[PDB]
From Swiss-Prot, chains A, B:
Species of provenance: Vibrio cholerae serotype O1 (strain ATCC 39315 / El Tor Inaba N16961)
Renumbered residue ranges of the record's region ACP-binding: 250-254
Record's protein name: Beta-ketoacyl-[acyl-carrier-protein] synthase III 2
Residues of the active site: 111, 249, 279
Pathway note: Lipid metabolism; fatty acid biosynthesis
Length: 358, 358
């Protein structure tokens, strides 16, 4: 029996920052409304491609683990906003980092993608030969947004987080996990007309609908994550009291609080950074984990609960038993190209196109 | 120790057929050129979305396995041509089939995606609780093609294949597998400007380049698949003589023959249907497997070699040990909506747009 220890962690948040007030300047919204409704105060807008964010997050996680690029056997990029479909962007990260030979694939399960990736990488390592893995959640959701639609325009942001996993006989890393999908709810959270369902040659094909039935999403999210968490707890033989830290998906602070409140888990155990970054889909969990660790919120041998949900409606929970080390073995000086533009400058063109089309 | 038996197989080929002569009518090519160069004589053009093809292939595989939709714990759709990115199309297949609860994700490793999916599903089942899985390779590559570019326009086609896997203690299904990616070659096979790297609001964004460096692809494919096959053979403790059947990716008949010739495997062991369908990327392997089985080419307890390669440059090989049953337990009458148009009629609009833009 073996396990996939999380030996490295890393993050990449692009610099350009879009505040709630910024949004209020071109949208019929308010900082009060956004902040009280969602807990979000800021989010980041990338001046680079998704794969670029993924790459920097990877470099930091690799440095953190002290592993050689030559030792990585598997690369998973959880994203729903890839630079390209042919080829995948896992291979771009691989090319960028000089990793030879490794299996490289993109995994799309929306905001639950990092948890799906962690589960997949862990089980691949447990049942076969993979010695080390890189699992990255990375998104440029700003690509998708309709800047005239306040319901969705204020929720999402860009970023990446990564882990490195290493095979071990110690009982650490992801233990039990339950991942799933409530497909009867597929239509409540969707951009159905970006992908091969779109009309390639229609000049209005950029003006797609972003379906977001907020209340039903909230209900189904709390239900799905909560039930998944119950299953993992029950199978683990841990009480709710023995969970040391919750690292939740960051969609809405009220969902986080409800999940905790209903699971009987103390609210202060939940790591929250949604106020800084908004909902970065697949990146939420690995960014939160990285920052939890950076901030000393996780101690060695802690039991962590992870939970997430997203379009699908995909959902998941997992139990991670931490090992001995919560500090990086080294640091990377990797960075994004400098950006000379505010978020508002970066979005300028898109905001004008969306507004012009109404 | 447990295993993931292939208990169900199924396929969906759309009806509209584009012959080599059809292509010659709007392209500076010939049936002689295509046929002698690639082995391709026909390919299918879908009148429906990728997810629709995936769904029919799934229904047949489910019927073949005699498993209940209630028993499926995992759904993987290997594709690089999804209807949509938000949400994934695995969840659409799930919704369509009424499968409750199952994990559902899209996996993108280009034409190696089905092998990546089979490996992933198998290891998930071996190391965790998943009882049954659906793994589907499905593509509408016709979405991507530039109908003025003869190098690529003649190679690719649409379709889907699926398997159902079931957990067992018998030593059957996927045994050893080696999957990988030669990222130094990422740029030789690419559509870099469909995805979030594209300019959403540029009215010429449909006219993307399809990079295809044919000779270097051929070289790197033969090398990668051949080395992967060597590793699986070596680790299995089987001689090349003990491989009963090869189910290869269908990119080019010369690649198939070279792979076999260089591996010392008799050419007549390789199942080939490229002449009918061309290169359907992730669907090639599962369609070939399904048809091999339909045609009685696989016997119980046979040792199968699978091999594939694609954009990335992803690559893989696997050894499948067949179990007892090579006939379906039942049949599905599922079908695509009727199509009243020839392939040429379906492509009409796209061909005119591409030609008009030169
Ligand atoms: Na504990
Ligand atoms: Na044999």
């Amino acid at each position: 029996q073996c396990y996939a220890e999380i030996t490295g962690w890393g993050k990449c948040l692009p610099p350009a920052t879009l505040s709630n007030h910024d949004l209020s300047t071109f949208l019929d919204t308010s900082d009060e409304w956004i902040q009280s409704r969602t807990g979000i105060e800021q989010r980041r807008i990338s001046h680079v491609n998704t794969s670029d964010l993924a790459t920097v997050a990877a470099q930091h996680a690799i440095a953190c683990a002290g592993v050689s690029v030559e030792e990585i056997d598997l690369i998973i990029v959880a994203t729903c906003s890839p630079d390209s479909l042919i080829p995948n962007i896992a291979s771009r990260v691989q090319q960028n980092l000089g990793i030879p030979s490794a299996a490289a694939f993109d995994l799309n399960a929306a905001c639950t993608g990092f948890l799906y990736g962690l589960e997949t990488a862990t089980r691949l390592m447990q049942a076969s030969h993979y010695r080390h893995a890189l699992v990255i959640g990375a998104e440029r959701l700003s690509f998708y947004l309709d800047w005239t639609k306040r319901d969705t325009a204020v929720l999402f942001g860009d970023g990446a987080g990564a882990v490195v996993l290493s095979k071990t006989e110690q009982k650490v890393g992801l233990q039990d996990a339950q991942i799933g999908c409530d497909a009867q709810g597929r239509d409540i959270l969707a951009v159905p007309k970006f992908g091969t369902a779109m009309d390639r040659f229609d000049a209005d094909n950029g003006y797609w609908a972003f379906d977001f039935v907020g209340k039903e999403i909230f209900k189904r999210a709390v239900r799905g994550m909560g039930a998944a968490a119950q299953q993992v707890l029950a199978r683990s033989g841990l009480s709710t009291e023995e969970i040391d830290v919750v690292i939740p998906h960051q969609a809405n602070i009220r969902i986080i609080q409800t999940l905790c409140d209903l699971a009987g888990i103390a609210q202060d155990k939940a790591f929250v950074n949604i106020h800084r970054y908004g909902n970065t889909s697949a990146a939420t969990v690995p960014i939160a984990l990285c920052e939890a660790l950076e901030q000393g919120k996780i101690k060695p041998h802690d039991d962590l609960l992870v939970a997430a949900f997203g379009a699908g409606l995909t959902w998941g929970a997992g139990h991670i038993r931490w090992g001995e080390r919560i500090t990086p073995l080294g640091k990377s000086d990797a960075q994004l190209p400098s950006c000379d533009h505010t978020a508002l400058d970066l979005l300028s063109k898109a905001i004008e196109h969306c507004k012009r089309h109404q």
